[PDB]
Design a protein around this nucleic acid. Structure first.
Ligand SMILES: [Cl-]
Ligand code: NA
Ligand code: NA
Ligand code: NA
Ligand code: NA
Ligand code: NA
Length: 1283
RNA sequence: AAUUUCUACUCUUGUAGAUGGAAAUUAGGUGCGCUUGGC
DNA sequence: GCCAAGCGCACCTAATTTCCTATAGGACTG
DNA sequence: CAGTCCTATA
């Protein structure tokens, strides 16, 4: 039966290992003498220049084909609708099939197989497409059919720089196939049209139809937005939101226009933006009238389309010119500063503001658009000035002060500019004083800016800060001048207005200088990057096989446990085999690898037999057999039957499973499969490369059930490596003469002083070349290796005479906090310029300092030029390339192991990650926040790093990365989770994110469990390097992932945190529906009683679940009724003796004590309750709307079981119901058998949603997990278990 | 405070854990500036 | 001061595709 | 006209 250790050797996994390459002997001198590094840098530079030129071909061709597309989209829309309605596997599969059909229909325009075009056009497209993904791209023939474009002389020089080297673009061809492919892939244009943009466009049509049906006037508004923008001029707004127009939204220029219909168009900064549809809808909602509420109740925001793949974006909005150099910015700004001085702008501004002390302020106007900005800059609150003006005007109204009269005053404050005297009279003399202070500060900063000189360059950050500071000062004055109203309606002071307009006009360029300078100064400086090395060999290191060594130039050696890469360059422009000579193992020397590989037999056997041009040519005119002798030890016969099998008139091939699944005749399929497999055996027994391989471990051909099973057993037999000793002198002579470039393959596990555990990656590598792996392959060495040169990129070091400071004190567990660490480090190195702090001096006897005996240099690896080697490997080589039924295999194990524990992993409000481990019945075994791992607080560190990045962006300085810190943290989380998983043999349950540290964590955890090696395990045990665990399903993408990946499960987050762990109770009410006095009374009427319990001091509110249905979320759960309890507000104590108050609630924050507040309410009303009578009829019949609202708010508070206050550290769960045994749950007791806080409660119920999945898998007769967990099923399940 | 590279370290000229590269594309985010509005 | 809808710029981050090849074919060399 | 070696498979 199943075993946990059986989850091994289930599918192949590819990884890349990276190493430094240390040149040996005269290798580096020879490389330098030959100039290989400089010419590879040049070839990389030429590639970077040539790629955008070549992309003109792809972009022009795709755009020309897209302009011809015309499809009927109704069938795809219907398949989308049916899937959305039914949400079944059948309708999902139907939509998937429909998407494939639509992607293919787009694709037929690229390849010229569409009925919608003529034969002549289709043939031209086929001729073009046939040469788009190979070196024919460069001949320029394709240029003749795209337009009148020819290539310039410089373009011809770039093209010629890849003569006999176009396979440098081998990968690029694949990247471009990924653009045109009809497959279901996100890189491709058909996918982009069919699965990204059409659903968006289809939803916009629905949004439009609902909006203009409910509010027909929006039709005219929308049409007028289109006409004002001047786009789609001969298409009505209705047609823009109809399916046939989508055929006109496939090219980027059309997509750009559509998105600007939605989004509008901006001109220069400081001028009015042209509104799009979404802004019009937003403004309509913000009117807050009756129409606004109707619009807001409907979907009211259109969705912009994604870009077309590869296309260049264009905009109708204004684009600033850009500065190009330090001297352009500084000199241009310096000329502007001098103009401002010459124009006496500062002197005039000061004179104007000084005039305000003695001129008539009733003719000085403040812009009503600026009033809240000014209130914020001058007063306590943004609304101080608005409220003061409102109050003053109300006090000037004549007659009765009605509600409409008040509203009129309110609306007038939005519509009219305000004279300065009214503001001063409304707000008082301290507004005047604040006004004077702000003016002086602004003017004084602008003055100091004009007088201060600019730096010589912008190379140093301090120089950038001078520039930014002076720009901030002038922009401040620009903002200040814009406080004043400009409208000609206001009775403006004539001379004051003319002078203000003058200096405003002169201040206008400040805005453009500000934006242009920021756009330049925040650019990332020139950075050193590694580049690929070729040594003038176009096919360098693409394969290791003995037959390709001369042309690929790459070989491997082992000597005394150290590994070496050999590179063999051309000699005087010619390839020349080195022909190393095997010698006895008694001889001093190097072990050279001999690599023997016949790649993927599914393609290589047809390539070398049935698909030969001579075979294909022969079978067009003949039916007799053809015999092959080249590269065969005895002739290989190809019959018409064998040829026809691999070359059917129509797919699928008869020996593929698809022929059996469709045709349904298994006699034909099994015969064809046996005949093909027999043919491969015939081929392999004779082909030069494979004739010597012993294949007798394969089954008789008829016994294989499908071709994938056969190839999965065959391919492992087609790969072998071995070693032969090469004499020392032959290798050293080859390096001495420059015939061999020899590098040690290096990482620090090969350092002389190495003595600890190796990196996992070192273990993969030494495992690969171990005797056991040589005897039977678990790890294969793959071709397509790459070499890089990384120039030095850094210039901080601990020098010999100095001291270093351990981060941990003498006890080797207490870390020194950062500010203390810096102070102590400076102090022990006699660089502290002041007294040691009290706390630092207290720590001083318990620190550990190290004498620097050898220099330790920060970033040392980046301070010199280095060589690097990236080499792919495949682990679990004996398995198939993909698993079959991985999830069912896990579920078979889980059904035989019903005691499998469960690890629940939640993302918290105050915790990055929280884990709860439960046994199979739900008992908590462990629970832990992962904010801190080994006394390092990653939560604090990450929060501090993000604050630093925000401040850096604001200051125009270097933005420090955060992804490396995130990865470092997550690697520690992975280590802990996996260790728990292996120790407990547990399932892991995560939040299904459809319902960022957490999402990246999910991918890293899945990926680790695709191929899990534990470095302490013996190589031959499961989990050791030669037998990795495989506990998750093969990862493809997040989009292509269900709710189970092997031992990992995904569950919906709802009702996992705000749920009572003792009962499964949740707040059943939707509080938005309890909104006025009448609905509050109906709500109270739906409760059986509220009464006081003299025995305990609690109040009991009895609720039947079939009442108050209009106010419920529709989730009746399992229990027919609940006793909701107002707990007596008495002191309780947690496990450590810390007091808390029972029943306390934290509400919007203030502490609330509902039972005490209920008592106070009842005594205010004179309502007798200490006799146990029902309280609700008394409140209802008295009908005091304030008392009834208080009652309802108290009930809502009691039912808010999660209570949080970031200021106090509170985040607890206190249930409003008692459980089976009388207990009202409170996490503040800190009982370690139950959730210790709200986040732990979430992780607990996450795990239990996994338990529900496992229990239903138990009670079923199949191996299929249920897909998803509805909220009612979850609540009924957990409430039934707990009650 | 050393690294294939990342994070955390320093009994240890190095230690513990992690680490699938390269190319290509796309999406999103943060910050700043601005527009019209809401509070 | 916060927020909504939207535009411009700077840079940072993450997801998803492909390949992980010896040999057939034939253009270039001389 | 062969051997070499880049291109593009299957
Ligand atoms: Cl919840
Ligand atoms: Na180590
Ligand atoms: Na990559
Ligand atoms: Na932005
Ligand atoms: Na605004
Ligand atoms: Na904005």
């Amino acid at each position: 039966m199943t075993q946990f250790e059986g989850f091994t050797n289930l599918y192949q996994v590819s990884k890349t290992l990276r190493f430094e390459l240390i040149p040996q002997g005269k290798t580096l001198k020879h490389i330098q003498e030959q100039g290989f590094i400089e010419e590879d840098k040049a070839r990389n530079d030429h590639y970077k220049e040539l790629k955008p030129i070549i992309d003109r071909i792809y972009k022009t061709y795709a755009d020309q084909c897209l302009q011809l597309v015309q499809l009927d989209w109704e069938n795809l829309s219907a398949a989308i609708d049916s899937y959305r309605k039914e949400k079944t596997e059948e309708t999902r599969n139907a939509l998937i099939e429909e998407q494939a059909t639509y992607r293919n229909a787009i694709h037929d325009y690229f390849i010229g197989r569409t009925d919608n075009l003529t034969d002549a056009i289709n043939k031209r497209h086929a001729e073009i497409y046939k040469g788009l993904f190979k070196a024919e791209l460069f001949n320029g023939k394709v240029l003749k059919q795209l337009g009148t474009v020819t290539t310039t002389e410089h373009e011809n020089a770039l093209l010629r720089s890849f003569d006999k080297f176009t396979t440098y673009f081998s990968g690029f061809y694949e990247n471009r196939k990924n653009v045109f492919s009809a497959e279901d892939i996100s890189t491709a244009i058909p996918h982009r049209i069919v699965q990204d943009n059409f659903p968006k466009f289809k939803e916009n049509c629905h949004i439009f139809t609902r909006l203009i049906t409910a509010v027909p006037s929006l039709r005219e508004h929308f049409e007028n937005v289109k006409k004002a923008i001047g786009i789609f001029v001969s298409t009505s707004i209705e047609e823009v939101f109809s399916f046939p127009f989508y055929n006109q939204l496939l090219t980027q220029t059309q997509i750009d226009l559509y998105n600007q219909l939605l989004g509008g168009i901006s001109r220069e900064a400081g001028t009015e933006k042209i509104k799009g549809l979404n802004e019009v809808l937003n403004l309509a909602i913000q009117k807050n009238d009756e129409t606004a509420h109707i619009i807001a109740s409907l979907p009211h925001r259109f969705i912009p389309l994604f870009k077309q793949i590869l296309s260049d974006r264009n905009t109708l909005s204004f684009i600033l010119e850009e500065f190009k150099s330090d001297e352009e910015v500084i000199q241009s700004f310096c000329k502007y500063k001098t103009l401002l001085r010459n124009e006496n702008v500062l002197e005039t501004a000061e004179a104007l503001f000084n005039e305000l002390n003695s001129i008539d302020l009733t003719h000085i106007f403040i812009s009503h658009k600026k009033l809240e900005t000014i209130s914020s800059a001058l007063c306590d609150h943004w609304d101080t000035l608005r409220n003061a003006l409102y109050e003053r005007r109300i006090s000037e109204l004549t007659g009765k002060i009605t509600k409409s009269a008040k509203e009129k005053v309110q609306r007038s404050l939005k519509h009219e500019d305000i004279n300065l005297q009214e503001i001063i009279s409304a707000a008082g003399k301290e507004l005047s004083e604040a006004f004077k202070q702000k003016t002086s500060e602004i003017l004084s900063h602008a003055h100091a800016a004009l007088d201060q000189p600019l730096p010589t360059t912008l190379k140093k950050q301090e120089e950038k800060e001078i520039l930014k500071s002076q720009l901030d000062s002038l922009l401040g004055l620009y903002h200040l001048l814009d406080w004043f109203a400009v409208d000609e309606s206001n009775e403006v002071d004539p001379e004051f207005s003319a002078r203000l307009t003058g200096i405003k006009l002169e201040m206008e360029p400040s805005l453009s200088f500000y934006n242009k300078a920021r756009n330049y100064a925040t650019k990332k400086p020139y950075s050193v990057e590694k580049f690929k090395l070729n040594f003038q060999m176009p096919t360098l290191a693409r394969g290791w096989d003995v037959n390709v060594e001369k042309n690929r130039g790459a070989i491997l050696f082992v000597k005394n446990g150290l590994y070496y890469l050999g590179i063999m360059p051309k000699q005087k422009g010619r390839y020349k085999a080195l022909s190393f000579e095997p010698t006895e193992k008694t001889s001093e020397g190097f072990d050279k690898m001999y690599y023997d590989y016949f790649p993927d037999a599914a393609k290589m056997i047809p390539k070398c037999s049935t698909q030969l041009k001579a075979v294909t040519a022969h079978f067009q005119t003949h039916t007799t057999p053809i015999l092959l002798s080249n590269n065969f030890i005895e002739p290989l016969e190809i019959t018409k039957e064998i040829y026809d099998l691999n070359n059917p008139e129509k797919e699928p091939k008869k020996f593929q499973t698809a022929y059996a699944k469709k045709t349904g005749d298994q006699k034909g399929y099994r015969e064809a499969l046996c005949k093909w497999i027999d043919f491969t055996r015939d081929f392999l027994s004779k082909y030069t490369k494979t004739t010597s391989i012993d294949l007798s471990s394969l089954r008789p051909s008829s016994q294989y059930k499908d071709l994938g099973e056969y190839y999965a057993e065959l391919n492992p037999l087609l790969y072998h490596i071995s070693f032969q000793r090469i004499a020392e002198k032959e290798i050293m002579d080859a390096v001495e003469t420059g015939k061999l470039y020899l590098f040690q393959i290096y990482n620090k596990d090969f350092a002389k002083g190495h003595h600890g555990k190796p990196n996992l990656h070192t273990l993969y590598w030494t495992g690969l070349f171990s005797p056991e792996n040589l005897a039977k392959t678990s790890i294969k060495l793959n071709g397509q290796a790459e070499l890089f040169y990384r120039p030095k990129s850094r210039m901080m070091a601990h020098r010999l005479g100095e001291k270093m400071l351990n981060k941990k004190l003498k006890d080797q567990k207490t870390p020194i906090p950062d500010t203390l660490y810096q102070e102590l480090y400076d102090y022990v190195n006699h660089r502290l310029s002041h007294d040691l702090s009290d706390e630092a001096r207290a720590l001083l006897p318990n620190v550990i300092t190290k004498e620097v005996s050898h220099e330790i240099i920060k970033d040392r690896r980046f301070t010199s030029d280095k060589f690097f080697f990236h080499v792919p490997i495949t682990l679990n080589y004996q398995a198939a390339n993909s698993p079959s039924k991985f999830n069912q295999r896990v579920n078979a194990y889980l059904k035989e192991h019903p005691e499998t524990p469960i690890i629940g992993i939640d993302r918290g409000e105050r915790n990055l990650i929280y884990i709860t481990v439960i046994d199979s019945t739900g008992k908590i075994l462990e629970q832990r926040s992962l904010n801190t791992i080994q006394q390092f607080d990653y939560q604090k560190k990450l929060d501090n790093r993000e604050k630093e990045r925000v401040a850096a962006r604001q200051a125009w300085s270097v933005v420090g990365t955060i992804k490396d810190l995130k990865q470092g943290y997550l690697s520690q989380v992975i280590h802990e989770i996996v260790d728990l998983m292996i120790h407990y043999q547990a399932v892991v349950v995560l939040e299904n994110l459809n319902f960022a540290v957490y999402q990246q964590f999910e991918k890293m955890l899945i990926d680790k469990l695709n191929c899990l090696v534990l470095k302490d395990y013996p190589a031959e045990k499961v989990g050791g390097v030669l037998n990795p665990y495989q506990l998750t399903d093969q990862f493809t993408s997040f989009a292509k992932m269900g709710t189970q990946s092997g031992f990992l499960f995904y569950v919906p987050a709802p009702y996992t945190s705000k749920i009572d762990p003792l009962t499964g109770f949740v707040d059943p009410f939707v509080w938005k529906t309890i909104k006025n006095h009448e609905s509050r009374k109906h709500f109270l009427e739906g409760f059986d009683f509220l009464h006081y319990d003299v025995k305990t001091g609690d109040f009991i509110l009895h609720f039947k679940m079939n009442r108050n249905l209009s106010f419920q979320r529709g989730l009746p759960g399992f229990m027919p009724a609940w006793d909701i309890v107002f707990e007596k507000n008495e002191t309780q104590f947690d496990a450590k003796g810390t007091p808390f108050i029972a029943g306390k609630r934290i509400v919007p924050y203030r502490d609330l004590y509902p039972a005490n507040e209920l008592i106070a309410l009842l005594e205010e009303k004179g309502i007798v309750f200490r006799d146990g009578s029902n309280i609700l009829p008394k409140l209802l019949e008295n009908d005091d709307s304030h008392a009834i609202d208080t009652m309802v708010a108290l009930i809502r508070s009691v039912l808010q079981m999660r209570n949080s206050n970031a200021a106090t550290g509170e985040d607890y769960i206190n249930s409003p119901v008692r459980d089976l045994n009388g207990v009202c749950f409170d996490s503040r007791f800190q009982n370690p058998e139950w959730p210790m806080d709200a986040d732990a409660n979430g992780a607990y119920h996450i795990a239990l949603k996994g338990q529900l999945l496992l229990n239903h898998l138990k009670e079923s007769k199949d191996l299929k997990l249920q897909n998803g967990i509805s909220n009612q099923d979850w609540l009924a399940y957990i409430q039934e278990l707990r009650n």
